[PDB]
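achromobacter protease I, Achromobacter lyticus. Tokens?
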Amino acid sequence: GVSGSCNIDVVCPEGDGRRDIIRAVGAYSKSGTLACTGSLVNNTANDRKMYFLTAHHCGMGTASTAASIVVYWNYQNSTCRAPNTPASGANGDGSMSQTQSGSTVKATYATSDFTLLELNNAANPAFNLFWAGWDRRDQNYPGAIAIHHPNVAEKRISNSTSPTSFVAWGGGAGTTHLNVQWQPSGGVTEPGSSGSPIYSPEKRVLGQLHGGPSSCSATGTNRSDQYGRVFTSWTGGGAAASRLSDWLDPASTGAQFIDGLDS
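Tokens:
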């Protein structure tokens, strides 16, 4: 696929130290057409349930649309294309043949923009998936890591080395979203990246992409994006079908954060 040349291939050196969480992320189609990103999350039972977090605005939070999903795992360029060079902006060589179809909706909620799906098929060991940890604490972080499929193309990594802040969707005063400031010549996010995770420096999911003003040509504070927060989604709409808690901490352990689980 094709995306902005400022984006960074996951196989580049920026992916070192993150080779586990890169494997939690997948691209997917809705009703046959490539649409958004989502990723696997661990739960306190550590049982590999196929909980796949994505964005509510992608439209998968209904039985019918959820049933139509096709996930594409390991879809990424085979070689690191130098960022900010025409090679990075060129059609990539990723393979789309490691796939699984079908899911059911566990919860969806418009305010923090999340949808939690459960994929129908258990993890195929050949895919070497990873279920990432999460952190539901009410705080900010000194930086963050995005793993995404911009334009639903080959997987990319974007780094933030600036503190996060709290905003309402659209950037106003509020606490439902995390505002993430991209590096001035670093990777950003693009349409199709929607639903992709943001991780803390410790590699735990903090939210999923809602959208924002970023682009490879954006400058200053416009080179940013907003993620619906796991803290907000945790209590969500007030019932199991609109929040994360029942699914992510089924064992009712009271965990504020957990680490990932490998395949």
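DSSP finds three helices and 19 strands in the chain.
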